[PDB]
């Protein structure tokens, strides 16, 4: 797939708002993911034991992880499709070390879209959401292709 420049613009416009508070958005997204799809929490040996949303909010390690994730994703989105170098180490660790199925990347995509919709309604109307969904589908398609090359296609 290929986004137009006008689609990238909508994506990078709402992303600039996210970057005003990366740690806060990171928290909201992971809590939404773990509440919505509790099976995903099992993949994290560091967080596995967290029982409630209160415990999740209070975890400093969870917050650092959310910042790690959104910083890597932001660097990919700012490439506007030219993200082959960035995807390689990402696909290799998630396929081979962490073992993260594509299905779970769809779950976190859903969480990202939920949280931008809550926090940024004015910059996240229907067209901006369509563009962000396109940018994440592109991300997933290219990651899935890399999984397949790496021997996982999970």
Tell me which residues touch ligand HEM (CB under 6 A).
Answer: 40, 43-44, 46, 68-69, 72-73, 90, 93-94, 98, 100, 104-105, 108
Nearer to ligand HEM, 6 or 97 (CB): 97
Q: How far is the CB of 46 from ligand HEM (least distance, A)?
A: 4
- Identify which of 145, 21, 133 has the alpha carbon closest to the alpha carbon of residue 77: 133
- Residues 6 or more apart whose CB falls under 8 angstroms from that of 92 comprise 146, 150
The dihedral formed by the CA atoms of 113, 82, 2 and 154, expressed in degrees to the nearest 10: -60
Q: How far is the CB of 104 from ligand HEM (least distance, A)?
A: 4
Residue 4 Cβ vs ligand HEM, minimum distance, rounded to whole Å: 22
Q: Sign of dihedral through CA atoms 18, 132, 2, 88?
A: positive
**CB closer to ligand HEM, 58 vs 72:** 72
Q: Closest residue (Cβ) to ligand HEM?
A: 93
């Amino acid at each position: 797939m290929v986004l137009s420049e006008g689609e990238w613009q909508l994506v990078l416009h709402v992303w600039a708002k996210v970057e005003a508070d990366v740690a806060g958005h990171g928290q909201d997204i992971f809590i939404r993911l773990f509440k919505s799809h509790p099976e995903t929490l099992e993949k994290f040996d560091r967080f596995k034991h967290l029982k409630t949303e209160a415990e999740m909010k209070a975890s400093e390690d969870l917050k650092k992880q959310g910042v790690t994730v959104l910083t890597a994703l932001g660097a990919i989105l700012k490439k506007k499709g030219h993200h082959e170098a960035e995807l390689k180490p990402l696909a290799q660790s998630h396929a081979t070390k962490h073992k993260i199925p594509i299905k779970y990347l769809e779950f976190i995509s859903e969480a990202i879209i939920h949280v931008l919709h809550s926090r940024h309604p004015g910059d996240f109307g229907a067209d901006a959401q369509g563009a962000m969904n396109k940018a994440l589908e592109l991300f997933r398609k290219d990651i899935a292709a890399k999984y397949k090359e790496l021997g996982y296609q999970g």
